[PDB]
Paper text:
An AlphaFold model41 was used as a template for molecular replacement to solve the Pd1 EFE apoprotein crystal structure at a resolution of 3.5 Å. The Pd1 EFE crystals have a different morphology but the same space group (P212121) as the PK2 EFE. Although Pd1 EFE is predominantly a monomer in solution, the asymmetric unit contains four molecules (chains A, B, C, and D) with the overall Cα RMSD for the apoprotein structure ranging from 0.19 to 0.32 Å. We were unable to model several disordered regions of the apoprotein (chain A, residues 140-144, 237-249, 274-295; chain B, residues 139-147, 237-251, 274-294; chain C, residues 236-251, 277-295; and chain D, residues 139-150, 238-244, and 275-294). The metal-binding site of Pd1 EFE resembles what is found in most other Fe(II)/2OG-dependent oxygenases, with the metal coordinated by His251 and Asp253, that derive from the loop linking β3 and β4, along with His327 that is situated at the N-terminus of β7. Of these three regions, residues 270-290 are disordered in Chain A of the Pd1 EFE crystal structure.
The ethylene-forming enzyme (EFE) from the fungus Penicillium digitatum strain Pd1 was heterologously produced in Escherichia coli and its properties were compared to the extensively characterized bacterial enzyme from Pseudomonas savastanoi strain PK2. Both enzymes catalyze four reactions: the conversion of 2-oxoglutarate (2OG) to ethylene and CO2, oxidative decarboxylation of 2OG coupled to l-arginine (l-Arg) hydroxylation, uncoupled oxidative decarboxylation of 2OG, and the production of 3-hydroxypropionate (3-HP) from 2OG. The Pd1 EFE structure includes a double-stranded β-helix (DSBH, also known as the jellyroll or cupin fold) core, an architecture that is widely found in members of the Fe(II)/2OG-dependent oxygenases. The overall fold of Pd1 EFE is very similar to that of PK2 EFE with a Cα RMSD of 0.6 Å.
Residue numbers in the entry: 48 to 139, 145 to 236, 250 to 273, 296 to 407
The structure:
């Protein structure tokens, strides 16, 4: 077993599926959607086989990840932006700290949303184009898989068409490039979390702890908090923790998210009788989570100094 030491968990026997290239509402899509829902309600997590074209993009993105983390520390620490939370975040012989490079929506300085000084909207601090192109193409392939999974959920739950896919139009998709060093419970604010890992392993989940073994050629998908809110605990939020192994581990964390301007509301079908009157504005939910997780960041201080949080109450940031 590739399980990190000093940890006690059960090995997971997850179901593996193959997503169709285009969800059309065929009887094959309805049967596949219902099978994925039962897997999420029983084990809390399922695996999806990568297409051979997606495997090439994962290898290119994994190569650009190791090339970035091989740079000197001061060259990586300079990858910070004052308008966007994307960039490098550190922990502390070779290395001994957990490093993360978040990639939010990359918008130039002349974009209307960045000119209006909206919170979290800004350029992405890429160190070079050699890292920007492969990681961007990897996010585009994960965006296609994330949308097909949402169409599977609407077909399995027999929801009205475009019930979930209409929220992710220009969605605030962001990717978290992780690196965990040698050994010598977190949540997830979103609809679906697509995670890909190497052969080292160290991912643990909590069914509705269980170790997720590394399987070549597949990525793992588990819902988050926003999915549980809309579905009335039908698809529960799966907590995840990472354990340090004997060797360095590289992994990805993709978040298929609604639009920054979209306001999610519970599904009236999945609620007995009347649904709650509560509504979550994702733009306010996203900024509140990053301002709490990264308080000492220059991005948070600028939002506080320039008082950009007052823009979250304007209707232009709530209609899309």
């Amino acid at each position: 077993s590739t399980m990190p030491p000093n940890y006690v968990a059960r090995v997971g026997q997850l179901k593996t599926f193959t997503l169709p290239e285009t969800a059309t509402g065929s009887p094959s899509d309805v049967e596949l959607g219902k099978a994925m829902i039962n897997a999420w309600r029983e084990d809390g997590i399922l695996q999806v086989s990568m297409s051979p074209r997606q495997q090439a993009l994962f290898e290119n993105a994994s190569a650009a990840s190791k090339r970035f983390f091989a740079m000197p520390p001061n060259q990586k620490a300079a990858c910070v932006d004052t308008q966007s939370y994307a960039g490098y975040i550190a922990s502390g012989g070779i290395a001994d700290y957990s490093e993360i490079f978040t990639v939010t929506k990359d918008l130039p300085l002349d974009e209307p949303r960045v000119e209006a000084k909206w919170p979290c909207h800004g350029p992405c601090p890429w160190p070079d184009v050699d890292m920007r192109t492969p990681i961007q193409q990897y996010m585009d392939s994960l965006g296609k898989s994330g949308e097909t999974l949402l169409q599977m959920i609407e077909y399995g739950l027999s929801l009205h068409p475009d019930t979930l896919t209409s929220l992710t139009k220009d969605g605030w998709h962001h990717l978290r490039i992780l690196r965990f060093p040698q050994n010598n419970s977190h949540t997830d604010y979103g609809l679906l979390v697509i995670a890909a890992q190497d052969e080292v392993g160290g991912l643990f989940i909590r069914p509705p702890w269980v170790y997720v073994p590394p399987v070549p050629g597949v990525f793992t998908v588990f819902p988050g908090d926003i999915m549980q809110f809309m579905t009335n605990s039908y698809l529960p939020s799966t907590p995840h923790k990472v354990g340090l192994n004997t060797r360095e581990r590289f992994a990805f964390a993709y978040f298929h998210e609604p639009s920054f301007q979209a306001v999610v509301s519970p599904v009236a079908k999945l609620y007995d009788g009347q649904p709650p009157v509560e509504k979550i504005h994702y733009g306010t939910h996203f900024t509140n989570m990053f301002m709490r997780n990264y308080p000492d960041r220059i991005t948070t201080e600028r939002i506080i100094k320039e008082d950009r949080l007052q823009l979250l109450d304007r209707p232009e940031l709530r209609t899309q």
